[PDB]
Symmetry: C5
Subunit: 99 residues, 5 copies
Amino acid sequence: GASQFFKDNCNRTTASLVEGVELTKYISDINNNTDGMYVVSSTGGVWRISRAKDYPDNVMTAEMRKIAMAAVLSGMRVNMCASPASSPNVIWAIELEAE
Amino acid sequence: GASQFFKDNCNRTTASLVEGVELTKYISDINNNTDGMYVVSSTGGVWRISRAKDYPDNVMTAEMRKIAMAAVLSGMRVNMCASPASSPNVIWAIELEA
Amino acid sequence: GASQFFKDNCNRTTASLVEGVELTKYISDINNNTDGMYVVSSTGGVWRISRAKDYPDNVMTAEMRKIAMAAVLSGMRVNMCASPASSPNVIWAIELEA
Amino acid sequence: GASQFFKDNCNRTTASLVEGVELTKYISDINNNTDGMYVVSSTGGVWRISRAKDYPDNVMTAEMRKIAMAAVLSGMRVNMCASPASSPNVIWAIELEA
Amino acid sequence: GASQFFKDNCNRTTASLVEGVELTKYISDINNNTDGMYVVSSTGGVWRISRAKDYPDNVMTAEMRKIAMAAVLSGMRVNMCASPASSPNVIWAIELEA
Ligand SMILES: CC(=O)N[C@H]1[C@H]([C@H](O)[C@H](O)CO)O[C@@](O[C@@H]2[C@@H](O)[C@H](O)O[C@H](CO)[C@@H]2O)(C(=O)O)C[C@@H]1O
Ligand SMILES: CC(=O)N[C@H]1[C@H]([C@H](O)[C@H](O)CO)O[C@@](O[C@@H]2[C@@H](O)[C@H](O)O[C@H](CO)[C@@H]2O)(C(=O)O)C[C@@H]1O
Ligand SMILES: CC(=O)N[C@H]1[C@H]([C@H](O)[C@H](O)CO)O[C@@](O[C@@H]2[C@@H](O)[C@H](O)O[C@H](CO)[C@@H]2O)(C(=O)O)C[C@@H]1O
Ligand SMILES: CC(=O)N[C@H]1[C@H]([C@H](O)[C@H](O)CO)O[C@@](O)(C(=O)O)C[C@@H]1O
Ligand SMILES: CC(=O)N[C@H]1[C@H]([C@H](O)[C@H](O)CO)O[C@@](O)(C(=O)O)C[C@@H]1O
Ligand code: NA
Ligand code: NA
Ligand code: NA
Ligand code: NA
C-alpha cells in the first residue's frame, strides 16, 4: 500500500488517492487537441501525466514519465494522487512501489 | 488490443490505426535525405518517429523514442496512429502495451 | 557497507550517515508545499532528494534520481548522507552498492 | 539481416554496409586528439559514433549512443552504414536488431 | 582485456591503464569540496568521473556516468585510463566490456 507520507500529502489537496494500480499501457500523442502523455490501467482507467517546461517541475514531471515506463515494463504497481477536475484526470503525484 | 482512448483519439484524425505491432529493428540515420529515427516491424513495415525541437512536443517525441527502444528490447507490442501521407508513414501517437 | 571514502566525506559535514538502506518506493510530487522527489525505505523511512537549478549541482542531482530509481527496481542497497535540518531529511550524497 | 530499408538508404551513399556485428565494448574518451565515443566488435573492429551539437542531428547521435550501449549490454546485433574515409570508420547510420 | 585501440589511446598520454575492474559502488555527492561523481571497485579503489558543462565533453562525461551505472548494475568489467595527478585519480577514458 501507499506510504503514509504519500497518503498524508495527497489528503491535503483536492485530489484523490488511487492505490495499487497496475499500469498496462503508456501513450505518447502529438495530435492536435489530444497531445500529451498518458497511462492506462489494467481495468481501462486513463490518467494524464503532468507537464512543465521549467525548473523545478520539469524535473518531477520527467520522473513521473520514467515511473510510468518502469511500471509498464516491470508490472510494479503505482499509487497516484490525481485531480478529478479534468478528463482524463491529471496526476499531481505518483509513487512507484517495489513492495 | 489498443485502449478505447487511443483508438478514439486516432479516429479523430487522417492517420491510420495499427494494432499489436512487434517492433524488431530501431534505426538512427544522419545521412542526407534519409536522416531520422525509424522503426521496423517483424513483417517488414517501416515507420518514421516524429521529432520536434521545442516544448511541449520535444517531450512527447523523446518518449516515442523511449517507447520504440523498449519495444525492440522487450518484444512488447505497440499500437500506432500513423499518417499515410508520407513514406515511411509518420507516427503521430504510439501506445506501448504490457 | 559504505565505502571508507563515502564515510569520510559525510563526516566532514553536519549530515548523518545511513547505511544499507533498501529503497522500495520512489515518489514524484508537484503539489504545493510538498513538491519534490522522495524515496521510502522498506521499513517506512522517508528522504528528500536534493534539487539544484544550475550546473554543476544539477548533474549530481540527476544522478541521485537515477540511483534512487535503480535501487527501487533492483533491490540494491544504498548508503546516504542526509541532513537533519529539515523533515524529510535531505540527501546530500548517496552511494549505490552492488 | 539488415532491413531492406536500411540497405537501400546506405546504398545511396559512399559509406559501406556492415551486417550482424556483435558489439562487445563501449568507449568514452576525453583525451586530446582521441576524444569521442567508440564501439569495438567481437573481432576487434573499431567504429566512431557520430556526434553533433545542434538539432536535429543531436537527437539521432544521442540515439546512436543509446543503441550502442543497448547492444553491448544485451548482445543484440547491429547493422551499420559506416564511412571508410576515416580511421576509425565513422557510423552514419545504425540499426539495432532483436 | 582492454582493446588494442583503448590501450594505444591511453599509451599516448601520461595516464595509467587499469584493466578488468569490477565496479561495486557509484557515488553522487553535492557537498562542499567533495562534490562530484565517483566509482569504487571491489578492492576499494576510488576514481572520479570528470564533469563538463559544454559540448562536446558534456556528451562524453554523460556517457562515462552511464557506463559506471551499467557496470555497477550488471557486474560487467571496465578498463580505465586514469590520471594519477589528482586523488582520487580522474578518469580520462573508460571502456565497458561485455
Ligand atoms: C499541482 C497543484 O498545483 N496542485 C494544487 C492545486 C492546484 O493548484 C489548483 O487546484 C488549481 O488547479 O491547488 C490546491 O489548492 C490550493 C490551496 O491549498 C490554497 O489555499 O489556495 C490555492 C489558490 O490560491 C489552491 O486552491 C488543491 O486543489 O488542492 C493544492 C494543490 O497542491
Ligand atoms: C501531428 C499533427 O499535427 N497531426 C494533425 C494533422 C497534421 O497537422 C496535418 O495533417 C498536416 O501534417 O492534421 C489533422 O487535421 C487536419 C487539419 O488540420 C486540416 O485542417 O484538415 C485536414 C483534413 O484533410 C485534417 O483535419 C489530421 O490530418 O488529422 C489533425 C492531426 O491531429
Ligand atoms: C553523414 C553525412 O553527411 N553523410 C553524407 C556524406 C558526407 O556529408 C560527406 O561524405 C562528407 O563526410 O556525403 C554523401 O554525398 C557525397 C557528396 O557530398 C559528394 O559531393 O560526392 C560524393 C560521391 O563521391 C557523395 O555523393 C556521401 O558521401 O555519400 C551523402 C551522405 O549522406
Ligand atoms: C549540500 C551542501 O551544500 N552542504 C554543505 C552545507 C550547507 O551548505 C549548509 O548546511 C546550509 O544548508 O554546509 C556545510 O558547512 C555543512 O553544513 O556541513 C558543508 C556541506 O558540504
Ligand atoms: C553529424 C555531423 O556532421 N557532425 C559534425 C558536427 C556538427 O556539424 C556540429 O556539432 C553541429 O551539429 O561538427 C563537428 O565539428 C563536431 O561537433 O564534432 C564534426 C562532426 O562531424
Ligand atoms: Na482529497
Ligand atoms: Na483515423
Ligand atoms: Na557528519
Ligand atoms: Na554504399
